[PDB]
Design a protein around this ligand. Sequence first.
Ligand code: ZN
Length: 331
Amino acid sequence: PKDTIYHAKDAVQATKPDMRKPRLVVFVVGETARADHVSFNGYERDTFPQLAKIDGVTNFSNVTSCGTSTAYSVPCMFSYLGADEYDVDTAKYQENVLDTLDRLGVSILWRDNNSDSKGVMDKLPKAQFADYKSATNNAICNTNPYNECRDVGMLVGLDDFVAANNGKDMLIMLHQMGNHGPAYFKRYDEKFAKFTPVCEGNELAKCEHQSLINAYDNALLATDDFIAQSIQWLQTHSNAYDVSMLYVSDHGESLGENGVYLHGMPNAFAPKEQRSVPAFFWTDKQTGITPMATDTVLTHDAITPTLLKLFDVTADKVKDRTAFIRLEHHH
Ligand SMILES: [Zn+2]
């Protein structure tokens, strides 16, 4: 073990959950989703029909991920250094935004249907991380012939967590399997097989291009569903809690441009398709939270100040950072 480098020991929470409505936020950490395959960003196909029916969803059309892989992007999304000073080999030892929120009294939960938190949860008690790739945590793993656990299974029993933390601020990270490839056709149940035909081979260049895109977009439909149902779960708590939902993908995906597939390329020569990511923010009416303009130039650096603002926490390190949400309030 090494000593922790601190970045926000000055951080303070301006209001406590016993003097105002406690706050409950779900942060969906996306996976392999491309911004240009989002309907709201101009994509021909309606890949997010369920989010289109929900009032108060803001789509952000200019979000660039810090990196092109899970191991690189996820720690930086929760970091105080920002991507320009970020070092993947020492991120584990920096105080991160979840450290700050937990220290100030916010109850943190991380459910993972992807891999793990890439070190972000390492300083917090183990019980606050849960592996939802296990079929004895996730009840939604036998709905497909692959025995693949589904992201929506992370919504089961969250009410037990809320009841165990009654009256406290809560931040729940849900780490998606999402659009992980190359086997996009495995990422969704049959109810989302909307675009056909579908590539079902493991070698992407060998399938016809339209079938690969169809499987990718079908996987997006399952993500649209997962985000929509996350909002619907939050809405059941809106009387007692100020509820909000943030979605950001960790990186994009190449889909055959210049013969390139998948992601994970070094930033120095990675194509833009691996960095252009969707971002969504939803909040209930009573929260008093105001989103930034949909065309704000944004990066993963916006995530940490957003989470801090959602819980009324000020940190000097990120005082000049742009977030997904505004600081003015209209009564
Ligand atoms: Zn990833």
